[PDB]
Amino acid sequence: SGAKFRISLGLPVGAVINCADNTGAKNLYIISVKGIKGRLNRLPAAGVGDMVMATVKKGKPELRKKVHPAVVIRQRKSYRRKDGVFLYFEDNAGVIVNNKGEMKGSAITGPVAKECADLWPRIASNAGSIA
Amino acid sequence: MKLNISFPATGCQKLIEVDDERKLRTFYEKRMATEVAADALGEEWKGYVVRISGGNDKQG
Protein backbone atom coordinates (compact mmCIF):
# COMPACT_ATOMS: atom_id res chain seq x y z
CA SER A 1 0.00 0.00 0.00
CA GLY A 2 2.91 2.29 0.75
CA ALA A 3 3.75 3.31 4.30
CA LYS A 4 4.53 6.88 5.29
CA PHE A 5 8.02 8.21 4.73
CA ARG A 6 10.25 9.32 7.57
CA ILE A 7 9.59 12.95 8.47
CA SER A 8 11.06 15.29 11.06
CA LEU A 9 9.14 14.76 14.29
CA GLY A 10 9.86 17.83 16.40
CA LEU A 11 7.20 17.22 19.09
CA PRO A 12 8.67 15.24 22.00
CA VAL A 13 6.92 13.97 25.11
CA GLY A 14 5.57 16.92 27.07
CA ALA A 15 4.55 19.04 24.09
CA VAL A 16 1.28 20.94 24.41
CA ILE A 17 -0.54 21.10 21.08
CA ASN A 18 -3.81 22.68 20.06
CA CYS A 19 -6.88 20.46 19.80
CA ALA A 20 -8.35 20.78 16.33
CA ASP A 21 -11.61 18.87 16.81
CA ASN A 22 -14.89 20.22 18.21
CA THR A 23 -15.14 17.92 21.24
CA GLY A 24 -14.58 20.86 23.61
CA ALA A 25 -10.95 20.24 24.54
CA LYS A 26 -8.72 23.27 24.06
CA ASN A 27 -5.32 21.55 23.99
CA LEU A 28 -3.54 18.22 24.36
CA TYR A 29 -0.47 17.20 26.34
CA ILE A 30 1.53 14.52 24.52
CA ILE A 31 2.74 11.86 26.95
CA SER A 32 3.95 9.18 24.50
CA VAL A 33 3.97 8.07 20.86
CA LYS A 34 2.68 4.77 19.53
CA GLY A 35 5.29 2.51 17.98
CA ILE A 36 8.34 4.11 19.61
CA LYS A 37 10.85 1.52 20.80
CA GLY A 38 13.27 4.14 22.03
CA ARG A 39 16.81 4.56 23.28
CA LEU A 40 18.56 5.70 26.42
CA ASN A 41 17.47 9.27 27.28
CA ARG A 42 15.99 9.81 23.80
CA LEU A 43 12.55 11.31 24.30
CA PRO A 44 9.81 9.83 22.10
CA ALA A 45 8.77 12.26 19.39
CA ALA A 46 5.94 12.42 16.89
CA GLY A 47 5.29 13.98 13.51
CA VAL A 48 2.13 14.57 11.53
CA GLY A 49 0.01 11.45 11.18
CA ASP A 50 1.45 9.66 14.21
CA MET A 51 -0.88 8.23 16.83
CA VAL A 52 -0.04 9.48 20.32
CA MET A 53 -1.40 9.22 23.85
CA ALA A 54 -2.30 12.59 25.31
CA THR A 55 -4.32 14.13 28.13
CA VAL A 56 -6.21 17.40 27.73
CA LYS A 57 -5.16 20.26 30.01
CA LYS A 58 -7.81 22.89 29.23
CA GLY A 59 -11.25 21.75 28.15
CA LYS A 60 -14.33 19.93 29.31
CA PRO A 61 -13.86 18.54 32.84
CA GLU A 62 -15.25 15.16 31.79
CA LEU A 63 -12.04 14.64 29.78
CA ARG A 64 -9.29 16.42 31.72
CA LYS A 65 -8.07 13.67 34.06
CA LYS A 66 -8.07 10.92 31.43
CA VAL A 67 -5.73 9.54 28.77
CA HIS A 68 -6.95 9.66 25.17
CA PRO A 69 -5.55 8.51 21.84
CA ALA A 70 -4.80 11.29 19.38
CA VAL A 71 -3.28 11.97 15.97
CA VAL A 72 -1.08 14.93 15.08
CA ILE A 73 -2.51 16.77 12.07
CA ARG A 74 -0.36 19.93 11.90
CA GLN A 75 3.21 20.50 13.02
CA ARG A 76 5.37 23.60 13.16
CA LYS A 77 8.59 21.74 12.36
CA SER A 78 9.45 21.79 8.66
CA TYR A 79 9.58 18.37 7.02
CA ARG A 80 10.56 17.27 3.53
CA ARG A 81 7.68 15.88 1.46
CA LYS A 82 9.90 13.69 -0.78
CA ASP A 83 9.74 16.29 -3.56
CA GLY A 84 11.88 19.07 -2.11
CA VAL A 85 8.96 20.82 -0.43
CA PHE A 86 9.84 21.65 3.17
CA LEU A 87 6.41 22.16 4.70
CA TYR A 88 5.72 23.70 8.10
CA PHE A 89 2.50 25.03 9.59
CA GLU A 90 1.52 27.99 11.73
CA ASP A 91 0.74 25.82 14.76
CA ASN A 92 0.94 22.39 16.32
CA ALA A 93 -2.47 20.75 16.35
CA GLY A 94 -3.98 17.31 16.69
CA VAL A 95 -7.38 15.67 16.85
CA ILE A 96 -8.59 13.16 19.43
CA VAL A 97 -9.19 9.64 18.14
CA ASN A 98 -9.73 6.15 19.54
CA ASN A 99 -7.96 2.81 19.11
CA LYS A 100 -9.67 1.84 15.85
CA GLY A 101 -9.20 5.16 14.06
CA GLU A 102 -12.51 6.96 14.51
CA MET A 103 -12.37 10.66 15.32
CA LYS A 104 -14.03 11.68 18.59
CA GLY A 105 -15.34 14.95 17.17
CA SER A 106 -17.17 15.74 13.96
CA ALA A 107 -15.25 18.72 12.54
CA ILE A 108 -11.63 19.77 12.17
CA THR A 109 -10.49 23.39 12.40
CA GLY A 110 -7.88 24.41 9.86
CA PRO A 111 -5.91 22.35 7.36
CA VAL A 112 -4.64 18.80 7.72
CA ALA A 113 -1.30 17.49 6.49
CA LYS A 114 -1.58 15.30 3.40
CA GLU A 115 0.42 12.51 5.07
CA CYS A 116 -1.88 12.48 8.09
CA ALA A 117 -4.95 12.45 5.85
CA ASP A 118 -3.60 9.58 3.76
CA LEU A 119 -2.74 7.58 6.88
CA TRP A 120 -6.13 8.06 8.54
CA PRO A 121 -9.07 8.16 6.08
CA ARG A 122 -11.55 9.20 8.78
CA ILE A 123 -9.55 12.35 9.54
CA ALA A 124 -9.28 12.84 5.77
CA SER A 125 -13.07 12.84 5.44
CA ASN A 126 -13.48 15.16 8.42
CA ALA A 127 -10.75 17.53 7.23
CA GLY A 128 -11.66 21.05 6.18
CA SER A 129 -8.73 21.22 3.77
CA ILE A 130 -5.52 19.40 2.87
CA ALA A 131 -2.20 21.21 2.97
CA MET B 1 -10.46 22.25 -24.51
CA LYS B 2 -13.57 23.56 -26.24
CA LEU B 3 -12.97 26.81 -28.11
CA ASN B 4 -16.02 28.74 -29.27
CA ILE B 5 -15.27 30.93 -32.29
CA SER B 6 -17.69 33.70 -33.26
CA PHE B 7 -17.47 35.56 -36.57
CA PRO B 8 -19.28 38.93 -36.42
CA ALA B 9 -19.87 38.94 -40.19
CA THR B 10 -21.44 35.48 -40.44
CA GLY B 11 -22.54 34.16 -37.07
CA CYS B 12 -22.91 30.38 -36.67
CA GLN B 13 -20.30 30.32 -33.91
CA LYS B 14 -18.64 26.93 -33.61
CA LEU B 15 -16.94 24.76 -30.99
CA ILE B 16 -13.45 23.54 -31.85
CA GLU B 17 -12.26 21.00 -29.30
CA VAL B 18 -8.48 20.92 -29.12
CA ASP B 19 -5.88 18.73 -27.41
CA ASP B 20 -2.67 20.70 -27.96
CA GLU B 21 -1.14 22.98 -25.35
CA ARG B 22 1.42 23.70 -28.08
CA LYS B 23 -1.30 25.37 -30.15
CA LEU B 24 -2.92 26.95 -27.07
CA ARG B 25 0.25 28.61 -25.74
CA THR B 26 -0.23 31.57 -28.10
CA PHE B 27 -3.38 32.41 -26.11
CA TYR B 28 -1.92 31.38 -22.75
CA GLU B 29 -0.78 34.14 -20.36
CA LYS B 30 -2.59 36.78 -22.41
CA ARG B 31 -5.81 38.42 -21.23
CA MET B 32 -9.24 39.04 -22.66
CA ALA B 33 -10.05 42.08 -24.81
CA THR B 34 -6.70 41.65 -26.56
CA GLU B 35 -6.01 40.72 -30.19
CA VAL B 36 -3.86 37.61 -30.64
CA ALA B 37 -2.97 35.69 -33.79
CA ALA B 38 -5.08 32.63 -34.59
CA ASP B 39 -2.20 31.45 -36.81
CA ALA B 40 -1.42 28.69 -34.30
CA LEU B 41 -4.85 27.20 -35.09
CA GLY B 42 -3.44 25.66 -38.27
CA GLU B 43 -2.46 26.94 -41.68
CA GLU B 44 -6.17 26.91 -42.50
CA TRP B 45 -6.45 29.56 -39.78
CA LYS B 46 -3.24 31.26 -40.90
CA GLY B 47 -3.87 34.96 -41.41
CA TYR B 48 -6.70 35.02 -38.85
CA VAL B 49 -6.71 37.57 -36.01
CA VAL B 50 -8.97 36.94 -33.02
CA ARG B 51 -9.82 38.70 -29.77
CA ILE B 52 -10.65 36.98 -26.50
CA SER B 53 -14.20 37.86 -25.44
CA GLY B 54 -15.06 35.45 -22.63
CA GLY B 55 -14.25 32.16 -21.00
CA ASN B 56 -15.41 29.45 -18.64
CA ASP B 57 -13.49 27.95 -15.74
CA LYS B 58 -12.94 24.24 -15.18
CA GLN B 59 -15.93 24.27 -12.80
CA GLY B 60 -18.26 26.14 -15.16
Binding site: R74, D83, V85, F86, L87, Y88, E90, G110, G128 | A9
Partner: protein, 116 residues
Protein backbone atom coordinates in the same frame (compact mmCIF):
# COMPACT_ATOMS: atom_id res chain seq x y z
CA UNK C 1 10.34 20.26 -13.78
CA UNK C 2 7.40 20.25 -11.37
CA UNK C 3 4.69 22.90 -11.28
CA UNK C 4 6.37 26.31 -11.23
CA UNK C 5 5.85 28.20 -7.98
CA UNK C 6 6.30 31.86 -7.14
CA UNK C 7 7.30 33.45 -3.85
CA UNK C 8 5.47 36.44 -2.40
CA UNK C 9 8.27 38.54 -3.93
CA UNK C 10 7.38 36.98 -7.29
CA UNK C 11 10.58 35.11 -8.10
CA UNK C 12 10.29 31.68 -9.72
CA UNK C 13 10.80 28.94 -7.14
CA UNK C 14 12.41 25.86 -8.64
CA UNK C 15 11.79 22.39 -7.18
CA UNK C 16 13.92 21.66 -4.14
CA UNK C 17 14.54 25.35 -3.42
CA UNK C 18 12.95 27.40 -0.68
CA UNK C 19 10.22 26.37 1.70
CA UNK C 20 6.42 26.16 1.62
CA UNK C 21 4.39 27.44 4.58
CA UNK C 22 0.75 26.70 5.43
CA UNK C 23 -1.43 28.78 7.75
CA UNK C 24 -4.32 27.80 9.99
CA UNK C 25 -6.76 29.81 7.83
CA UNK C 26 -5.90 27.58 4.88
CA UNK C 27 -3.60 29.97 3.01
CA UNK C 28 -0.44 28.39 1.59
CA UNK C 29 2.57 30.49 0.61
CA UNK C 30 6.00 29.61 -0.74
CA UNK C 31 9.28 31.38 -0.06
CA UNK C 32 12.47 31.34 -2.09
CA UNK C 33 14.67 31.65 0.99
CA UNK C 34 14.79 32.71 4.62
CA UNK C 35 15.12 36.41 3.72
CA UNK C 36 11.77 36.38 1.92
CA UNK C 37 10.28 34.21 4.66
CA UNK C 38 11.44 36.55 7.43
CA UNK C 39 10.07 39.59 5.62
CA UNK C 40 6.71 37.84 5.23
CA UNK C 41 6.68 36.76 8.88
CA UNK C 42 7.54 40.27 10.08
CA UNK C 43 4.62 41.38 7.87
CA UNK C 44 6.57 43.83 5.74
CA UNK C 45 4.53 44.87 2.72
CA UNK C 46 6.36 43.71 -0.43
CA UNK C 47 5.41 46.91 -2.24
CA UNK C 48 8.02 48.89 -0.28
CA UNK C 49 10.91 46.41 -0.48
CA UNK C 50 12.90 47.70 -3.42
CA UNK C 51 14.02 44.38 -4.92
CA UNK C 52 10.65 42.63 -5.22
CA UNK C 53 8.62 42.17 -8.39
CA UNK C 54 5.64 43.90 -6.80
CA UNK C 55 7.80 46.95 -6.08
CA UNK C 56 9.11 46.97 -9.65
CA UNK C 57 5.60 46.71 -11.09
CA UNK C 58 4.21 49.41 -8.78
CA UNK C 59 7.01 51.89 -9.51
CA UNK C 60 7.00 50.95 -13.23
CA UNK C 61 10.60 49.79 -13.22
CA UNK C 62 11.34 47.55 -16.17
CA UNK C 63 8.49 49.11 -18.18
CA UNK C 64 -6.48 50.02 -29.98
CA UNK C 65 -10.20 49.57 -30.59
CA UNK C 66 -12.00 48.49 -33.77
CA UNK C 67 -15.11 50.05 -35.30
CA UNK C 68 -16.89 47.88 -37.88
CA UNK C 69 -19.69 48.80 -40.28
CA UNK C 70 -20.74 45.37 -41.52
CA UNK C 71 -23.78 45.10 -43.79
CA UNK C 72 -25.84 41.91 -43.72
CA UNK C 73 -29.37 40.93 -44.72
CA UNK C 74 -32.66 41.01 -42.82
CA UNK C 75 -34.61 37.85 -41.96
CA UNK C 76 -37.25 37.13 -44.58
CA UNK C 77 -35.70 39.47 -47.15
CA UNK C 78 -33.18 39.38 -50.02
CA UNK C 79 -29.59 40.52 -49.51
CA UNK C 80 -29.31 41.72 -53.10
CA UNK C 81 -32.73 43.41 -53.00
CA UNK C 82 -32.01 45.42 -49.85
CA UNK C 83 -28.73 46.89 -51.14
CA UNK C 84 -30.36 47.58 -54.52
CA UNK C 85 -33.31 49.26 -52.79
CA UNK C 86 -31.08 51.42 -50.58
CA UNK C 87 -28.94 52.33 -53.61
CA UNK C 88 -32.00 52.99 -55.78
CA UNK C 89 -32.09 55.91 -58.18
CA UNK C 90 -32.72 59.38 -56.70
CA UNK C 91 -35.11 59.98 -59.60
CA UNK C 92 -36.88 56.76 -58.59
CA UNK C 93 -37.14 58.13 -55.04
CA UNK C 94 -38.59 61.47 -56.16
CA UNK C 95 -41.01 59.63 -58.45
CA UNK C 96 -42.00 57.57 -55.41
CA UNK C 97 -42.65 60.63 -53.26
CA UNK C 98 -44.71 62.40 -55.94
CA UNK C 99 -46.74 59.26 -56.68
CA UNK C 100 -47.42 58.89 -52.95
CA UNK C 101 -48.40 62.59 -52.87
CA UNK C 102 -51.00 62.04 -55.59
CA UNK C 103 -52.01 58.81 -53.83
CA UNK C 104 -52.71 60.96 -50.78
CA UNK C 105 -54.57 63.35 -53.10
CA UNK C 106 -56.91 60.59 -54.27
CA UNK C 107 -57.21 59.45 -50.64
CA UNK C 108 -58.35 63.01 -49.85
CA UNK C 109 -60.84 62.76 -52.71
CA UNK C 110 -62.13 59.47 -51.26
CA UNK C 111 -62.43 61.19 -47.87
CA UNK C 112 -64.43 64.02 -49.47
CA UNK C 113 -66.65 61.53 -51.32
CA UNK C 114 -67.40 59.68 -48.07
CA UNK C 115 -68.05 63.03 -46.38
CA UNK C 116 -70.58 63.98 -49.08
Amino acid sequence: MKVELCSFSGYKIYPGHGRRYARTDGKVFQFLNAKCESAFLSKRNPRQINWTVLYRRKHKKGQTRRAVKFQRAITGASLADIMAKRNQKPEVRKAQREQAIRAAKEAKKAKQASKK
